[PDB]
């Protein structure tokens, strides 16, 4: 049967800016029920629910433990899954994607993803496993390979009903350690466009997607074929509050346009009357479309300020966050014998 995205909510510790302008905290949990509220300057709570709740003292390991390992066991199986980090610009997307590599708790989804898939294929000599990623951003509505060698030639998307929707010419690599996904994981870093704004000073200009391949043989013939995206989306702003101007504002209106795009796929999968999904608004939400309504096991990390001054942006995140939960999936695993 169908079953549902799941959801969850991670609150980051206050920022500089917000200290500077004095502002309170606005959001409240309860972790071990799921519960998350957010409190206007009134007192008035809006209250909801998710499969998971993380404050400001949240670890990326809780996170990972908690709710992505499950997802990374079933691509090991032959499942597709998606994890992605959605949320306003410096919210912790990108931290909770990539975190702080040497400090063990802190280390994020995507390297405890690559630990999580080679320990369970060193522990496994009855399948013999391959393993391939791809890297890719969505920048000005145009998909770039991060890994590639012409990290400026726009790629195309096709669609084909046993592969879904894929990027033609995308570089693929083989990776047989952990070491391997790292270096492509760093060179990728360094390819993807970012820039400075008054709400993060290290700001992702691109939605990027980071794609791990499992593809397992079988002792009785069969080939399962796993496939695992990592997801780290850029963030909605304000230029009132980034003070953007030029490219970086050209790259704002682009970043706004298709997280809204995601927003209304989000609201016409829930909303009980659309016989339509709106997937082709931007190449983001072609590329995310088989999570969101798909052959797919998929969680969204919806990310969120602590601010006062960030209640209309939280609660934004919060509200879109609250719908893709009751967004139904029908995941099966991808095994073609002989
Ligand atoms: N939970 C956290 N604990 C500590 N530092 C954090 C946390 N979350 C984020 N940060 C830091 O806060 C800054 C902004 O977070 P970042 O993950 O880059 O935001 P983002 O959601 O990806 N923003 P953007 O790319 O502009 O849409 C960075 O310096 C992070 O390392
Ligand atoms: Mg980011």
Redesign the pocket.
Same mark, same amino acid.
């Given at each position: 049967a169908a079953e549902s995205v799941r959801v969850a909510v991670?609150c980051?510790?206050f920022?500089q800016r917000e200290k500077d302008l004095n502002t309170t905290l606005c959001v409240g949990m309860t972790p071990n029920v799921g519960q998350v509220n957010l409190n206007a300057p009134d007192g008035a709570a809006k209250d909801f629910t998710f499969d998971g709740a993380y404050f400001?003292d949240?670890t990326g390991e809780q996170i990972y433990n908690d709710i992505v390992f499950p997802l990374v066991e079933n691509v090991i199986e032959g499942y597709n899954g998606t994890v992605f +980090?959605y949320?306003?610009?410096?919210?912790?997307?990108?931290?909770?994607?990539?975190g702080?590599e040497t400090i063990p708790a802190?280390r994020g989804v995507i390297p405890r993803a690559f630990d999580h898939i080679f320990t369970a294929t060193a522990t496994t000599e009855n399948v013999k496993f391959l393993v391939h990623c791809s890297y890719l951003e969505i920048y000005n509505e145009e998909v770039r390979d991060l890994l590639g060698a012409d990290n400026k030639q726009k790629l195309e998307i096709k669609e084909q009903p046993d592969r879904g929707v894929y990027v033609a010419g995308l570089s693929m690599h083989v990776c047989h350690d952990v070491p391997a996904c790292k270096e492509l994981m760093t060179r990728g870093f360094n390819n993807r466009h970012?820039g400075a704004?008054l709400?993060?000073?290290?700001?992702?200009?691109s939605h990027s997607i980071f794609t791990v391949y499992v593809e397992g043989m079988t002792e009785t013939g069969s080939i399962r074929m796993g496939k695992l995206n990592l997801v780290?989306? +850029?963030?909605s702003?304000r230029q009132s509050k980034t003070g953007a101007t030029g490219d970086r504002l050209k790259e704002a209106t682009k970043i706004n346009l298709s997280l809204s795009a995601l927003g209304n796929v989000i609201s016409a999968l829930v909303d009980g009357k659309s016989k339509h999904i709106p997937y082709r608004d931007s190449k983001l939400t072609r590329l995310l479309q088989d999570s969101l309504g798909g052959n797919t096991k998929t969680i969204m990390i919806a990310?969120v300020s602590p601010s006062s001054d960030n209640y209309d942006e939280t609660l934004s995140t919060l509200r879109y966050a609250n719908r893709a939960k009751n967004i139904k999936n029908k995941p099966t695993i991808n095994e073609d014998p002989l």
């Open positions: 991670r980051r510790p920022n400001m949240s +980090a949320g306003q610009t410096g919210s912790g997307k990108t931290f909770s994607m990539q702080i802190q970012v704004t709400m993060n000073k290290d700001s992702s200009r780290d989306l +850029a963030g702003e990310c």
